[PDB]
RNA sequence: UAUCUACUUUAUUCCUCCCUGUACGAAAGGACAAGAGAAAUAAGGCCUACUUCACAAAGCGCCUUCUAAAUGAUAUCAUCUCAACUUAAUACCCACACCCAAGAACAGGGUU
């Protein structure tokens, strides 16, 4: 049941998710709505990926 | 239809101050109704301009192309040319200066 | 070691295997002429929204086509020879957005292939094709796995999308595969335009428009330029392009069927505006 | 991109290279068997195969004369390429030559061939022979073959 | 027998079927229009329809200089001057806006091609448009004209003296030196009409060319 | 193709064509964002240094095939409203002039001749 | 004389014309949009013609280019609401040897 997480406050609409194709003008900056209409996993995945340790366990 | 009568039925009835048509023959590959008319003034061959423009867009032939004015922005010479027929609304000072009634019944005999 | 088919044969044999094998083949694509006699799959008709089969062509070549407003119109041949449906693979088993047809075109030797690719020739029953594209399509235009699409499955008027191989100009420098000649960055950003091997990349020319198919030969001629070389093979599908994607109204829907033996067609269907050959010299009076 | 460019370039020009292809011409119409490195052998294969056509024109033909003066420079082979070669091969049309490889080259490591004009008086070549028709697999064959051919 | 040279496809790599489909179109128009035997010396007039008049046609007349292209879309130049200017015209032979070509002096020159005119003098350019069509007689080879043109001075169009060209129809003793000439004795390759491999020979092309012709009748 | 720099072969019955001067008359500038005119384009044209508009009637490179070329640059007059300076016109012009998009009506008036 | 890092195939615009000299204004004035055109550039191809040339490669040549409303509370009216409610990516790609439109080598395609 990812699709149905619920943030608190405003962060569906000020939390931003960025990344950037290494390409030049190629940074993308998509708030947590968008994501969550893109794929209603990533949000849960990557707050869950930036939990674990950075090292080469993680993935 | 939109032919040479219905072409002196809108100058005479815009009454043109002067008309001399020539029958093109059909070798020298231009048209075949050469119309020089001349009028009043710049509003007046202007007027008549966009009046006869206007009679034949709204008048007949859709599958024929839309015709452009040429020579809007210039005051003694304005010219519009069609399918069978050209029209060349002037000056007759204009028409004395370019001479064109002579030019194309004397092909190669004048200067 | 490794060997080939030709290694052991006796000069006796070497022949006999030529018309024994090409034999097969012409019998092979000869008993495909009846799809219709056989049973095919349910035909459906047009509905607006729907995907139909695509082709693979040889490209013949170029000439020049008048239409009546006496403008050239330079034009691609494409033959289609010996194309065919290969499988059907439903969108369920697809995992895509849609089902797919693959689709095969030319006639190619048996003795250069993998054992797998003969095996399943063998089961589909038909001599190797030298490419298998794959069609993205709707439900409704599915035809049965075994069957000829032939050059009328287009008609004159449709616009047309081909896909084939670029030429390829082997490594170029920066003035001929890009046409030219920070501080701060320290590094040479992806996708820097630098010398590198041009061409041989598939390329599609979009909306193109088909002025005149030729039902005996099995020509397509399709306006302007279409990517490769003569007598490469592309992939000539229906246009995506939105001005053009509702106008299968017209367009036999699964495909053309000579075997429907209904109101069969001339030697080459023309569009409107082309000026035939043996029409009177035209005159814009 | 050299699509379609049919011709090696070799030597130190054009003409270097209509040098070289018709020494080694004029060495084959004189030995009629030659050892010469690959590429410059079936790029003169090529020009001693028109050269036989061009003897089949007889002798008279002044256009024939005019192409033999060029291509032997020794002039005493223009009468053997009328009278010897041409006459050898009145009755076949084409394929007067046969090049196969040599194991390559001591010095160099170059890829070598030898051509020879067919039907010559020098010791035959060992040539490539098919495998014997009385193997298994043509054994094999030799009995589909005539299964095939009770069909009718 | 005289063959058009559209018919003769240069060599290449493409499939002879595309000639079958092109030939077949190319006889198909020659139904309907008369294309007649013509070489690069010839004066003709063409009458074609003009896309600009409202279906009033015209007629030009000048030198055929160059006869290039092969297939369905050859052409032919030809060139006249007129009014003190020199024009030349590309005509597309199976264009359908051509109605007649008539052949008025049917004359072979002594070149194939014969570019080397726009500087020549303008005498040995210009031509009568009303000149009347001279009568050849039905069973005769083709008078071979021959005439050394003069040339104007120097900075030509190209480099006409150099034996790349092959020029035949100029008197060059009028209108360059000795010097120059043998300079442009350079650039001769003697070696390149001798080699068997450029040879082109189009025989059996001829012949399937000819049951293409006689098929279509 | 006439760009910048070109000399140019005017023709017409105009005074500033006529004239002669010891500068063959060539262009300045060409009215299309490249810098390259075609038959039926405007130049700025350096006569008798006095810079004139002009209109490019035929050319020597190759168009269209059924198009003419010429041995020379004919270009014809103007004047800045439009109407043009010559009042015969003797080399032939072509009727290529009729279809594009322009002033070219007057000058079709003006023609001896038409290829 | 390149050792290391990095890298080496991620459609716009102008003019014309029409709609229309209508909408809008009241006269002067004067639309949009969408459409047809012609151009130009960029991007991607291609050689039928033309041109440099000639089993081909090219361009000067041709082809293609897809926040605003209503309603409405705090504050019974109103109020666009950091009040709530209602309403306004497809395509592409996917299995020895000899010749090659494939190619630096390797690889690739073809060899019926
Ligand atoms: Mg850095
Ligand atoms: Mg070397
Ligand atoms: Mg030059």
């Known amino acids: 049941n990812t699709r149905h997480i619920a943030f608190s406050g405003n962060k569906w609409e000020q939390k931003v998710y960025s990344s950037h194709t290494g390409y030049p003008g190629g940074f993308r900056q998509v708030t947590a709505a968008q994501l969550h209409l893109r794929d209603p996993v990533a949000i849960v995945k990557l707050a869950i990926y930036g939990m674990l340790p950075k090292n080469l366990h993680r993935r | 239809k939109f032919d040479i009568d219905m072409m002196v039925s809108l100058l005479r009835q815009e009454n043109a101050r002067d008309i001399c048509v020539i029958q093109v023959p059909p070798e020298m590959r231009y048209t075949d109704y050469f119309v020089i008319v001349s009028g009043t003034s710049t509003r007046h061959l202007h007027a008549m301009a966009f009046y006869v423009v206007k009679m034949y867009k709204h008048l007949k032939c859709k599958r024929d192309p839309h015709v452009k004015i040429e020579g809007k922005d210039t005051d003694d010479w304005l010219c519009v040319d069609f399918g069978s027929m050209v029209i060349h609304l002037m000056l007759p000072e204009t028409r004395e200066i370019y001479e064109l009634e002579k030019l194309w019944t004397l092909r190669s005999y004048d200067d | 070691s490794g060997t080939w088919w030709d290694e052991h044969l006796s000069e006796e044999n070497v022949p006999f295997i030529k018309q024994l094998v090409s034999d097969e083949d012409k019998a092979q694509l000869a008993s495909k002429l009846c799809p219709l006699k056989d049973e095919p799959w349910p035909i459906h008709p047009w509905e607006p929204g729907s995907f139909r089969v695509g082709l693979i062509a040889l490209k013949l070549g170029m000439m020049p086509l008048w239409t009546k407003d006496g403008q050239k119109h330079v034009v691609t041949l494409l033959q289609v020879q010996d194309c065919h449906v290969l499988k059907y693979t439903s969108k369920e088993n697809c995992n895509g957005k849609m089902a797919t047809l693959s689709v095969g075109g030319k006639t190619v030797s048996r003795f250069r292939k993998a054992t797998s690719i003969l095996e399943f020739y063998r089961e589909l029953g038909l001599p190797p094709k030298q490419t298998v594209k794959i069609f993205n399509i709707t439900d409704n235009a599915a035809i049965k796995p075994g069957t000829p699409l032939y050059a009328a499955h287009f008609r004159p008027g449709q616009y047309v999308d081909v896909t084939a191989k670029t030429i390829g100009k082997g490594f170029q420098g920066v003035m001929k595969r890009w046409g030219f000649k920070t501080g701060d960055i320290g590094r040479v950003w992806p996708g820097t335009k630098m010398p590198g091997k041009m061409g041989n990349i598939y390329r599609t020319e979009y909306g193109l428009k088909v002025w005149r198919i030729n039902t005996k030969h099995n020509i397509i001629y399709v306006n302007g330029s279409v990517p490769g070389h003569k007598n490469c093979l592309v992939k000539v599908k229906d246009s995506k392009l939105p001005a053009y994607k509702d106008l299968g109204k017209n367009l036999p829907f699964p495909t053309y069927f000579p075997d429907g033996d209904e109101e069969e067609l001339p030697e080459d269907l023309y569009d409107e505006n082309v000026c035939q050959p043996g029409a009177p010299s035209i005159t814009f009076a | ?152 | 027998r005289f063959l058009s040279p559209e018919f003769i496809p240069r060599r290449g790599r493409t499939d002879p079927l595309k000639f079958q489909i092109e030939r077949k179109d190319m006889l198909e128009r020659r139904k309907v229009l008369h294309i007649p035997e013509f070489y690069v010396g010839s004066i003709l007039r063409v009458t074609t329809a003009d896309p600009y008049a409202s279906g009033k046609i015209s007629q030009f007349l000048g030198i055929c200089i160059q006869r290039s292209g092969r297939g369905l879309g050859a052409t032919f130049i030809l060139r006249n001057v007129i009014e003190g200017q020199g024009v030349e015209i590309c005509f597309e032979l199976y264009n359908p806006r051509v109605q007649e070509i008539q052949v008025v002096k049917l004359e072979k020159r002594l070149d194939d091609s014969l570019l080397y005119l726009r500087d020549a003098l303008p005498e040995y350019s210009t031509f009568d448009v009303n000149m009347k069509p001279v009568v050849q007689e039905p069973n005769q080879k083709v008078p071979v004209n021959e005439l050394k043109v003069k040339m104007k001075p120097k900075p030509w169009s190209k480099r006409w003296e150099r034996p790349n060209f092959n020029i035949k129809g100029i008197r060059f003793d009028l209108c360059l030196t000795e010097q120059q000439m043998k300079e442009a004795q350079k650039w001769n390759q003697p070696w390149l009409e001798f080699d068997m491999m450029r040879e082109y020979d189009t025989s059996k092309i001829e012949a399937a060319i000819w049951k293409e012709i006689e098929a279509s009748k | 193709a006439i760009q910048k720099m070109t000399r140019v072969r005017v023709v017409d019955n105009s005074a500033l064509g006529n004239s002669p001067y010891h500068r063959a008359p060539r262009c300045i500038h060409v009215y299309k964002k490249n810098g390259v005119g075609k038959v039926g384009d405007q130049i700025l044209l350096a006569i008798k240094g006095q810079k004139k508009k002009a209109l490019i009637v035929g050319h020597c490179m190759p168009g269209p095939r059924m198009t003419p070329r010429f041995d020379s640059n004919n270009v014809v007059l103007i004047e800045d409203n439009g109407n043009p300076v010559g009042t015969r016109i003797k080399t032939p012009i072509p009727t290529s002039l009729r279809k594009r998009e322009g002033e070219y009506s007057k000058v079709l008036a003006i023609a001896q001749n038409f290829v």
């Open chain 4, 1 to 152: 991109i050299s699509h379609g460019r049919v011709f090696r370039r070799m030597g130190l020009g054009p003409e270097s290279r209509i040098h070289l292809l018709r020494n080694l011409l004029t060495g084959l119409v004189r030995h009629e068997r030659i050892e010469a490195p690959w590429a410059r052998v079936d790029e003169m294969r090529g020009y001693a195969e028109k050269l036989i056509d061009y003897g089949k024109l007889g002798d008279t033909n002044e256009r024939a004369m005019r192409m033999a003066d060029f291509w032997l420079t020794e002039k005493d082979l223009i009468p053997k390429l009328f009278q010897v070669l041409a006459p050898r091969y009145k009755d076949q049309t084409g394929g007067y030559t046969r090049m196969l490889q040599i194991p390559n080259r001591s010095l160099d490591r170059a890829k070598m061939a030898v051509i020879e004009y067919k039907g010559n008086c020098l010791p035959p070549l060992p040539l490539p022979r098919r495998d014997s028709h009385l193997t298994l697999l043509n054994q094999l064959l030799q009995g589909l073959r005539q299964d095939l051919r009770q069909s009718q």
